[PDB]
Structures are given as C-alpha cells and as structure tokens.
Amino acid sequence: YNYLYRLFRKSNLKPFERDISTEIYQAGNKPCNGVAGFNCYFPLRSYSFR
Amino acid sequence: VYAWNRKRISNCVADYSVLYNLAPFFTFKCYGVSPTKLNDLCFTNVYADS
Amino acid sequence: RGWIFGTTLDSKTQSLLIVNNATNVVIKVCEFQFCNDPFLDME
Amino acid sequence: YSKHTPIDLPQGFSALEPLVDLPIGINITRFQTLLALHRS
Amino acid sequence: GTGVLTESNKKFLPFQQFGRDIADTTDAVRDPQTLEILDITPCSFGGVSV
Ligand SMILES: *[C@@H]1O[C@H](CO)[C@@H](O)[C@H](O)[C@H]1NC(C)=O
Ligand SMILES: *[C@@H]1O[C@H](CO)[C@@H](O)[C@H](O)[C@H]1NC(C)=O
C-alpha cells in the first residue's frame, strides 16, 4: 500500500505537474474544515497490489 | 504517482541501444521522436519521470 | 539580492529560490518553508 | 532574461539578453522579491 | 547539412549558438569542443545550358 494516487481534486492538473498537497477535499455543499466525515474524503488512496 | 520523481539527465553521453535490445519492458512507445534514431541525436533539458 | 517563486510558498508545493549573496549566485529548487517577510541582512 | 545599464524609468531602448534557461517543471503563480536591510 | 564551412566575421553573443537566414535554414553554427563560429555556405551550383 506504499503507492498512492489522487482520487479527488477540484481541477485537472497542468502538463508536467505534481500535486502532493494532503488537504481534504469538499465533495458536497457543506465545508469539511480539514476533518473527515460525510462527503469528506481523503484525496490520496493506496493501491491494493497483490 | 501523486509524488512522481523527476530526475535530470545532463552532461552525459547516452547509449539508447542497450534499452531497446533488452526484453523486460512491455511498452517502449515514443511520440515525438523515432525509437531507432535516439542514438544519432543530441538532446538537452532531459528528464525522467518515474 | 534575489527573488522567490512558487504557488503557495510553503512545504506543500515546490518553490524556486534565486539568491546572490556576498560571494556567489545560488539557484535552488526546494520545498522551502518560507517566512511571511523573508529578507537578507558585512552581510 | 537580464540586462545591466549604466544610468522614473529612462526613455530609451535596451534589449534584454537571455541569462538563464532553467529547467524546473514546477507551477509558479506567485512571486516575492528579497531585499537587504542596513543595520546601524 | 551539406555545405562549405568557412571562417566568419559575425559577432555572436555568448548565449547564441547558431544562425538562421531568411529561409530559416542554418547559415552559421558554433562547433562543440572548440566553441568557434563556422559560417555555412551552400555548395557551388548553377544551371547547365547546352
Ligand atoms: C498552478 O496553481 C494554480 C493556483 O495555485 C492553479 O489554479 C493551477 O491550475 C496550477 N497549474 C497547474 C498546471 O496545475
Ligand atoms: C552564499 O550562499 C551559499 C549557499 O547558501 C553559501 O554556501 C555561502 O557560504 C554564502 N555566502 C556567505 C558569505 O554567506
């Protein structure tokens, strides 16, 4: 699980651009305030390599 | 992939023939340059994104 | 003496630093934790 | 690109010679210059 | 390219490496190893009338 990808972001990246910011994403109308919960998910998820 | 490593290749002579002849790489696909012409050209501002 | 370039100017993103101090000209690309008021100050 | 001239802004022509071509490949949207203080 | 390499009197600036004519074809080049500036002139040609 050492390899992670950005599942959620507000906008698409530019060419040759890396995003490593571990900020929470707001998927709904309600603000998340940096805390996980309903419709608040972490952007980086790990691959299940077996 | 979210934190992909970019390495600069500079001030070296590169033999690309040893990359083509080896069989472990499933995909060797080039877009802006011919694969067989890489040994005959000179380049700068070279980066490997891993 | 120099300039600071970036997007958020912190360790979250990657930033470019150009400085010329008393001896030599240094160009660095690092993830700097920049000051709100960065400056230089014989030096 | 840089140019040094021995001298509001003067009215004249001076082409800026390219000084550094830098391969960064990073996003830049905001900048800030660095000054030097004098302490007494 | 195919041409005659001759001495040149064109004062290239330090950043400048090669030169381009009206047609955008290279007319002068800076040789590696020696850093000298060589003028490139196309080889002698003309029409043959019988
Ligand atoms: C660079 O950053 C700005 C805001 O910080 C953002 O809007 C833009 O999409 C970024 N560019 C790329 C290529 O990601
Ligand atoms: C100037 O900066 C470089 C890199 O940070 C450093 O090695 C050098 O000692 C500095 N010069 C002085 C006089 O502090």
Ligand SMILES: *[C@@H]1O[C@H](CO)[C@@H](O)[C@H](O)[C@H]1NC(C)=O
């Ligand atoms: C090799 O080329 C460099 C320029 O890249 C030059 O400074 C050096 O003098 C050359 N050496 C020889 C032996 O030609």
